[PDB]
Design a protein around this ligand. Structure first.
Ligand SMILES: Nc1ccn([C@H]2C[C@H](O)[C@@H](CO)O2)c(=O)n1
Ligand SMILES: Nc1ccn([C@H]2C[C@H](O)[C@@H](CO)O2)c(=O)n1
Lengths: 227, 226
């Protein structure tokens, strides 16, 4: 098959959706075919739709969803509130496998955190990554407390032998404060920092976003993602 | 000896120092001798030297610390920026052991989160918890993302066989809201929820904070700590 990458965050609201789009844009521009998969989407009643956002910002059209829940809560609670159930583990793995093919980069966007329950019982994005032999791209902040959260996530990945594809600082302030710069240097000693996306990237139009995305990642790294 | 109990958070700003104070205040009202050790703290020239806050709210007098950095950063970064190394694993552990005595609950308050580098090289509060044979009490939010962070912390505790003495919701909002109501229930399915402390408790005077604290914890669990 191709290259499957799960995109997860140290926490909720760290810019993970925008990272998926930036990476998708950079990969499309290197001539890589990109599919983006969101197995579990919550907060639809509030208008949350990360697949749609990825399409808006990066012009990706191969966008695969599965479970959508109205309330902006953790999937287990959002499902319970709507009188629905969570998807089965193999339903998630099947959705990803249908997209996977040679020369394609498939991004699997988690639902707010590596150990959030996506399927019963206690099945997480980490178990999914094991099933489909995916590495994990970890989206992080530059603020106080990021080093603990990142190290917590990276330890959890290694515990099931899920390779870490690297870190992305989801939102990098201009200008960088004293705390941010120090945290960035510390983040780079823990794992590779593939990119630090400028804040407000979600406001750029299709041209500026594509340009932002192209400059943000190392070309050699993106091209090296799929044969 | 007595009971050594580390108090760690899932992040910064979750109410951990207020929780340390509340447990101390509850344990004091149960007739238990309490010491609070915060080996390293940061962001002092910014907001509160945390040992003093525990004294103010809880009246603890055995307050032990080794290092204070003014920058609001994790210890390693604050010490890097200061040009002044962290304490050593040995002094942190010896400091704590020398506080430990029968009939005494010694609370050890981490700086930030469990895997924050506390003493060089790369010694974390998790390491310290092993060397002093202490269980870990985990302070968590009720907000979105607490289940991820709690599960991650409990996994990091178990990976070095550090027992978990339960969870405290550091700040319980009013009114709760849908997520917080849900997370409180979900948290109880991962571990024992020892207490949920009302938001704004840091502003209480000593008598009100002591009343809150006695009501917040189960008397039987507190008394059983020692
Ligand atoms: N580089 C970034 C990262 C995030 N965001 C926005 C998008 C979301 O609305 C919120 C994080 O979820 O912040 C942005 O504009 N630019
Ligand atoms: N139950 C609580 C927990 C925390 N805080 C305060 C203490 C700190 O000032 C801030 C949390 O970092 O909020 C509070 O007032 N009541």
């Amino acid at each position: 098959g191709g290259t499957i990458l799960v995109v997860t965050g140290t926490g909720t609201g760290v810019g993970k959706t925008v990272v998926c789009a930036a990476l998708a844009s950079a990969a499309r521009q290197a001539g890589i075919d990109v599919a983006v998969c969101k197995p579990v989407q919550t907060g639809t009643a509030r208008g949350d739709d990360d697949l749609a956002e990825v399409g808006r910002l990066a012009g990706v059209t191969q966008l695969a969803g599965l479970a959508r829940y109205p309330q902006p809560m953790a999937p287990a609670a959002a499902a319970e509130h709507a009188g629905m159930a969570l998807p089965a583990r193999d339903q998630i793995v099947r959705l990803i496998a249908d997209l996977d093919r040679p020369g394609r980069l498939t991004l699997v966007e988690g639902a707010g955190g590596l150990l959030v329950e996506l399927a019963e019982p206690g099945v997480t994005l980490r178990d999914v990554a094991v099933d489909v032999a995916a590495a994990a791209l970890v989206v992080v902040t530059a603020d106080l407390g990021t080093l603990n959260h990142t190290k917590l996530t990276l330890e959890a990945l290694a515990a099931q032998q899920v390779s870490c594809a690297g870190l992305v600082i989801g939102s990098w302030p201009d200008p960088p404060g004293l705390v941010a710069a120090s945290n960035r240097s510390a983040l780079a000693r823990i794992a590779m920092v593939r990119a630090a996306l400028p804040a407000g990237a979600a406001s750029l139009d299709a041209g500026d976003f594509a340009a932002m995305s192209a400059a943000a990642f190392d070309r050699n790294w993106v091209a090296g993602l799929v044969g």
